Design a protein around this nucleic acid. Sequence first.
DNA 1: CTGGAGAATCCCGGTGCCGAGGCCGCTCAATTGGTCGTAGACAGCTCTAGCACCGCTTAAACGCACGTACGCGCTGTCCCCCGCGTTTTAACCGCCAAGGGGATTACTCCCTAGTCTCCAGGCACGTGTCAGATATATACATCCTGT
DNA 2: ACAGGATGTATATATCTGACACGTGCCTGGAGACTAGGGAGTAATCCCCTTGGCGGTTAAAACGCGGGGGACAGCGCGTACGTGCGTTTAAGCGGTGCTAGAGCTGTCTACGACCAATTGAGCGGCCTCGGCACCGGGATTCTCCAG
Lengths: 105, 104, 84, 85, 94, 94, 98, 98
Amino acid sequence: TRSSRAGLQFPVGRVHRLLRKGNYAERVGAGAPVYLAAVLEYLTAEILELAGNAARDNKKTRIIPRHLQLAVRNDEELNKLLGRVTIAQGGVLPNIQSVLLPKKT
Amino acid sequence: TRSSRAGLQFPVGRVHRLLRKGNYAERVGAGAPVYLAAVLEYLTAEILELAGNAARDNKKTRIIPRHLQLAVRNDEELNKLLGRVTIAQGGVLPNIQSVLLPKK
Amino acid sequence: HRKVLRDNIQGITKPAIRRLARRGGVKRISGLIYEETRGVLKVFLENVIRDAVTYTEHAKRKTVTAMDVVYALKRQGRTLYGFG
Amino acid sequence: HRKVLRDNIQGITKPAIRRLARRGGVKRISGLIYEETRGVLKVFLENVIRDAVTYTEHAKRKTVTAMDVVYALKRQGRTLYGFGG
Amino acid sequence: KTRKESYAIYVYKVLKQVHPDTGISSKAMSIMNSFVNDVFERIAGEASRLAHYNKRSTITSREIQTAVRLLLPGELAKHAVSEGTKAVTKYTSA
Amino acid sequence: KTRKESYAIYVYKVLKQVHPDTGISSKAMSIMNSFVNDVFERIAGEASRLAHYNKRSTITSREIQTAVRLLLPGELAKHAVSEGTKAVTKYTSA
Amino acid sequence: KPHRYRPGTVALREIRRYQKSTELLIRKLPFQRLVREIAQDFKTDLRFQSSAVMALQEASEAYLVALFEDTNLCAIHAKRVTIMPKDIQLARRIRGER
Amino acid sequence: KPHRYRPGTVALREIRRYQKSTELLIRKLPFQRLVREIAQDFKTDLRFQSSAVMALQEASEAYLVALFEDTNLCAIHAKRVTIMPKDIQLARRIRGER
DNA sequence: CTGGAGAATCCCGGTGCCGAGGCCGCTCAATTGGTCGTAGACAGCTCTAGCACCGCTTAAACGCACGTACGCGCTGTCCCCCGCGTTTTAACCGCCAAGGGGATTACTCCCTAGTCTCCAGGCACGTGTCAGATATATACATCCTGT
DNA sequence: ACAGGATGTATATATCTGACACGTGCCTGGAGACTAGGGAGTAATCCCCTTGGCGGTTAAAACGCGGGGGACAGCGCGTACGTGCGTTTAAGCGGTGCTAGAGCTGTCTACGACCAATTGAGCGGCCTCGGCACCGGGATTCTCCAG
């Protein structure tokens, strides 16, 4: 496969067809979806990696979208890429302002 | 002059080129640049009109970008179309918060 | 084919707005918060489904779908995954 | 040649930050406003210049133009007319 | 030199339609120019995103009607779309 | 049904690469699917207008490198470019 | 002895719960009737897929929740621990609504 | 005979003037050197058109001036008529600038 | 000041069940292999526009005094909202009915890319005014004491 | 609470000067008249998936009732920054010089669509059981009212 011609696990042909069929440029070059499939494989691996670490660290064996919520919102840069994106069944990462915590001794 | 074939004053052919040569669809129908040209002549018309009256209020004859600044920012709808757009050499409307006003 | 409907805005209850605020991390809620909250939710839904119903009208279809409102949410800069 | 420039961040004068506050409709300015003001302006120009340089290395040109940075301001949702495009 | 078009003659013509004995300065002319390029790319872009949903690859005037009825808020959407029907119908009846 | 495309088996494969013995739920799979589509039209559109500015008509890997260096924040840009050049060259060696 | 909990233990403990949980809060049929009622104005006699009603529910709760995040920062910035409606009006103005 | 004014007449009359006028008011050579020195970090040995430095001057005035709009509404919402750096920090978090 | 009800919260254990994961056919989109005009790397000029430099004026920036008013912490005082028992009450759920409208597949056909030539619309390029900045002198509008 | 310096600000009047509205020329992109394959309007059907109703339970909502703590007005006291005047000082100007690189135009060429046969690969139908709920019981921890 062309994924094996590049050593990846993403569809070069399907992504390639999707670059030609959205009217982005009249010509589409030789190795462009190779590069772009590499970038998306890195990003997918990052988010699923952090949801894996949080997936053990909240005692399940299966990634649910809650782990995608606090998986994404804990890295700074993944949050900055996705700062305008709600993800459904995510909820809120636990933030408590300092004046709300009790004034005990 | 397909503007005269439609009764307008905007370039149907130049806009038609710009719809065909920006890779939006694979193909562009007949009536569409007439439509978009009509809409842009409307928007252009009242924005220059509000710059017209709000240009005459500065007693001038030449509209400068200050007149486009408050000419946009006075109407609600033109402001909501352009609420993320800075205008160079525009400045601000005279907004003053009421607690700052000297109230003896 | 004569389905009529009115006054559902009070159906969003006072404890429901309490539950959303406490998901937001809010301790104490004043009295007139609830009516204004119904107003803000009403404005947001008026814009979102005003824009969504136009997507449903352009395909000349009489049924609003999920892709309709996810696309209309995307256009307002409030993109929401998990439906398409 | 190869010139080196050092410490231009204090060139934003305290009266200039006063003047921009006067256009904003700000009456009175506290003490450490100016440090944070130079910091915020520094961050914003760092992002805009970074994206403009990215727009300029891609055409492989040594000179940054104005269409470069109107494009870079457009992409960050801060569109600015009056220089084309 | 290298010719690059604008809208400045056309903006000047609509200015002559509205307040005809009242001129325009050059910075405001270039601001109007980039303004109508901005609205042109918003509406053409919305036509792209709207055609890219219905499995259609053609931008007729009706898609511009819908996309104007999504961008422009309310009243000027009404008169904008009404002038659009005036120009389609005023076009084809000739 | 009409055969809808997805990404779900690929996301499952990268899940097999990172944490090989770990599951994933179905709505999370549709989250990642819409994520991959969202990023895909982001850098696709950035490639569109970024290729439109330079009077070109072709999307090559230099354009995707620039556009990734515009959307990806910093440290996320660098390893994306290292994997990108590794996949271009690793492709090209065959 | 009448037994009670203070003003704040139910609050902060219940903040820990409703931050910690994930599900959708406001009930299905009143919200569904709400979306249909606002939907009748722009066009008569519509139809909804059920998941689209869940979608408007999800974006509507997330927009309100983020609004209470920000109006909470507003009223805390007044050295108050109570949301009041002018704080809501402030955060809506700073986000660029009115 | 001090010939003086209140602390605020020069301020409010100054608000009428600097809201009233439009021109560019951070000096062009220190601003230009500032843009060049920030520009040296990403790549070296640069060249600028002049109007691009004008354009970054417009983004500087628009972003700072709007940040004092929202910062001023922040501090007025504390029943204060004087802005302070925590208010700057508040409006930056509300716009999502962290 | 520090110690017990006791109530909410966390730690194992069987259950179930169903949604996550996997397997078997299988249409079709990737794939491979040639062409082909052409978009674009590539070379070279050009001249123009950005960068460098030097002297002069000076608006603007800098810095010292000063005072008052703005921030802010304490004090009291009220009330609105938090908390919890009690009623109710309408939401949730299962199932049963009906069809209107989405999705599909086909049918037919008008229509919008594509070509080639034809010409004037706009656009580059001199040009010379009338609109505005700039003094320049001149009488109001409101500020600020001091009464 | 009024009156007057004074003082910054609004109101004619010239005046140069130059930025814009305009006239000359041109050339190429708008357009005009054809063709042609295909995208899409349009019909009809399949069925399914939205709507509707009805009964049974009941978690949630409503509501009444303590009560206390959180908003907020007053208020005193500090400090820091706005105001204004003498000092400096480098920014603007304004010309002068030099050449690096944007931009143009031409050269030559490696590369993406066009078809077009070939096929396994991802996808839908269809099983199947193990992980999450999920009661269900039970020790921990934290809070709140006592010392």
